[PDB]
Amino acid sequence: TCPFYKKIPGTGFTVDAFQYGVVEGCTAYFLTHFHSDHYAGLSKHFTFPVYCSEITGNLLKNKLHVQEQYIHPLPLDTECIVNGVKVVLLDANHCPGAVMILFYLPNGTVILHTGDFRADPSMERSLLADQKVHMLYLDTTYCSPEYTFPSQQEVIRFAINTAFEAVTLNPHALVVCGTYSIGKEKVFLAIADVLGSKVGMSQEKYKTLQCLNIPEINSLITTDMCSSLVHLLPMMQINFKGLQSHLKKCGGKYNQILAFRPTGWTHSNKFTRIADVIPQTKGNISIYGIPYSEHSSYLEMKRFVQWLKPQKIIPTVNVGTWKSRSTMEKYFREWKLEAGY
């Protein structure tokens, strides 16, 4: 059965609620982004209205075969009316096509659901600036002060400089980047751009990327692995055995692999700076775990909420244990007392 934190009071609406069958009283199902923990349940047999971004709608139609007549894409930053309720989709700074949803309830209550997000000061100047928000359904993935990580820009600077140095020293090195879902496309695209190469990948991954409206993508990606010196592989193959095996398949074109695993957070963060990151190496294979996050750090999340000043916060992540829930509630109270709301 559907949990309370996926239900929007006073409406017929749910958010990211496709794995519970037919939800009692739901007349429209919203989907924030195309990640499997959120879309789980959708298919060609789904016949209720789904509201989502244009990019998410392209992925529903092509990857899951949801029928067109049931996909309702909405433009961003635009006031829209859904079953008599005003809604706005905002960029969530997560993966491609990911949104936050603003609901303006008939009684005057305003609700923000962040979906999954990486808070940024640029959000303090969207349509959020223009009215009060009473309830916040908040992506609390990293809601503890030990979660610090660098900016996306600093992480991409590290990766480009590392890859460019390695291939310049050895023109026969192959670069490999792991992936298992959409998101973090800048990692592999920036490395290919500095090296003068396309990114080579499976036909299934190329199809997924072509759904994303990324400008000049036919320019950066390919299914011809032989013409590419940056390859994308499933995340599970980013280990010494997986990579040794891949190198065998390349026919003696390459004699070294440099591989990247974009993780979220890893406890090496509390003690080490990005500049200081080192790989794991075995033979002619090196593997770098880089802290590229598409979720808010603690400080980014705290800044957003202290700016928005919501009357009530509803966490959507880490809600399954009493200790996690109590920890989160204690930080929300600090934030409110420090800021004065």
CB of 338 to Ni ion, least distance (A): 29
Q: Which is nearer to Ni ion, 89 or 174 (CB)?
A: 89
CB of 135 to Ni ion, least distance (A): 21
Q: Which is nearer to Ni ion, 35 or 198 (CB)?
A: 35
CB of 325 to Ni ion, least distance (A): 21
Q: How far is CA 148 from CA 115, 267, 323, 339, in A?
A: 21, 10, 21, 21
Reported residue count of the chain is 341
CB of 301 to Ni ion, least distance (A): 15
Cα dihedral across residues 210, 216, 220, 222: positive or negative: positive
CB of 237 to Ni ion, least distance (A): 22
* Assigned token pair, 150: 């660098």
Q: Which is nearer to Ni ion, 37 or 68 (CB)?
A: 37
Q: Which is nearer to Ni ion, 116 or 300 (CB)?
A: 116
Instruction: Specify the residue for token string 């310049």.
Output: 168
Q: Which is nearer to Ni ion, 38 or 246 (CB)?
A: 38
Q: How many CB atoms lie within 10 A of CB 290?
A: 21
Q: Which is nearer to Ni ion, 39 or 260 (CB)?
A: 39
Q: Which is nearer to Ni ion, 5 or 240 (CB)?
A: 5
Q: Which is nearer to Ni ion, 116 or 185 (CB)?
A: 116
Nearest one of 227, 230, 149, 237 to 190, comparing CA atoms: 230
CB of 295 to Ni ion, least distance (A): 8
CB of 172 to Ni ion, least distance (A): 37
CB of 25 to Ni ion, least distance (A): 26
Contact residues toward Ni ion (CB under 5 A) are 35, 116
Distance CA 186, CA 138 (A): 25
CB of 330 to Ni ion, least distance (A): 25
In contact, 198 and 274? CB cutoff 8 Å: no
Distance CA 290, CA 155 (A): 7
Q: Which is nearer to Ni ion, 140 or 162 (CB)?
A: 140
